[PDB]
Amino acid sequence: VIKFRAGVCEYNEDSRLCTPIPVQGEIEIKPNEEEELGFWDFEWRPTEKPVGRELDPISLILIPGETMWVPIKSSKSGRIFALVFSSNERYFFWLQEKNSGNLPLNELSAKDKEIYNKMIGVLNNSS
Amino acid sequence: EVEKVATAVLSTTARAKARAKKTKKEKGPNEEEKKKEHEEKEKERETNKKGIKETKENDEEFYKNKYSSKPYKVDNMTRILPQQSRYISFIKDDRFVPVRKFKGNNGVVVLRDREPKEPVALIETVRQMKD
């Protein structure tokens, strides 16, 4: 199980604005093993900061071929953790992890290699 | 420990001397006739090496200048005794040039960077490492 500090972030189909509504919480990834698709559960939890749209916890399953990873999405903010579902289960997270700070930074985190490896492992692969 | 065993070897050879003057005449040929140890020069022997652990500083010869007048390069982030600080001048060859004049004293000094868009390594504070 891989945890890092993350916030909730808004999703849009309008123009794909994708700027964080900042909070503070975590994402906690269970890699799972259930069937051939893996179904890795991304459970988001708030721990402080009700300000904005808090988003009560919801676990989101990884369905492969509908979800997608791109580190930016409109180059307003980097670190766009993407679970694409086209307004079904679509809720976004924005890593807020400490690697040079919790800041927005383009092409994900400052520890560049570290975090690309995680994305391929969780998102693209199926257990 | 080193001196104990260096003194050991040397003293034994000295004692043997008086017998040795006449021995040494027979010894020369018997090496050519029979065999030699691993060298064919003389007979040369062991000497032993002594233990010296400390590399001491001498003292100055010039007290009139203890700071010469010649150039020397002094790196940023180093021990800076107040005598040096007077002759520190920031060089233009670098991007980095002082905002005002330099005080001639040690301290936190802020510089104007003409090209901050070019990669230079930077030195992380303690606080940075922990993030």
From Swiss-Prot, chain A:
Record flagged with keyword Cytoplasm: yes
Modified residues (Phosphoserine): S127
Pru domain mapped to chain residues: 1-126
Subcellular location(s) per record: Cytoplasm; Nucleus
One Gene Ontology term, aspect cellular component: proteasome storage granule
GO terms under biological process: proteasome-mediated ubiquitin-dependent protein catabolic process; ubiquitin-dependent protein catabolic process
Annotated GO MF terms: ubiquitin binding
Keywords from the named record: Acetylation, Cytoplasm, Nucleus, Phosphoprotein, Proteasome
Note: Present with 12200 molecules/cell in log phase SD medium.
Subunit structure of this chain's protein: Component of the 19S cap proteasome complex composed of at least RPN1, RPN2, RPN3, RPN4, RPN5, RPN6, RPN7, RPN8, RPN9, RPN10, RPN11, RPN12, RPN13, RPT1, RPT2, RPT3, RPT4, RPT5, and RPT6. The 19S subcomplex associates with the 20S proteasome subcomplex to form the functional 26S proteasome.
Biological function: Component of the 19S cap proteasome complex which acts as a regulatory subunit of the 26S proteasome, involved in the ATP-dependent degradation of ubiquitinated proteins.
Family to which the UniProt record says this protein belongs: Belongs to the RPN13 family.
Protein name: 26S proteasome regulatory subunit RPN13
Native species: Saccharomyces cerevisiae (strain ATCC 204508 / S288c)
The encoding gene: RPN13
Included stretch of the parent chain: 7 to 133 of 156
Curated annotation (Swiss-Prot), chain B:
Modified residues (Phosphothreonine): T7
Comp. bias regions, Basic residues: 16-25
Post-translational note: N-acetylated by NAT1.
Basic and acidic residues bias spans: 26-57
Quaternary structure annotation from Swiss-Prot or TrEMBL: Interacts with UBR1.
Function: Acts as a regulatory subunit of the 26S proteasome which is involved in the ATP-dependent degradation of ubiquitinated proteins.
General remark: Present with 4750 molecules/cell in log phase SD medium.
Recorded family membership: Belongs to the proteasome subunit S1 family.
Protein name: 26S proteasome regulatory subunit RPN2
Organism per entry: Saccharomyces cerevisiae (strain ATCC 204508 / S288c)
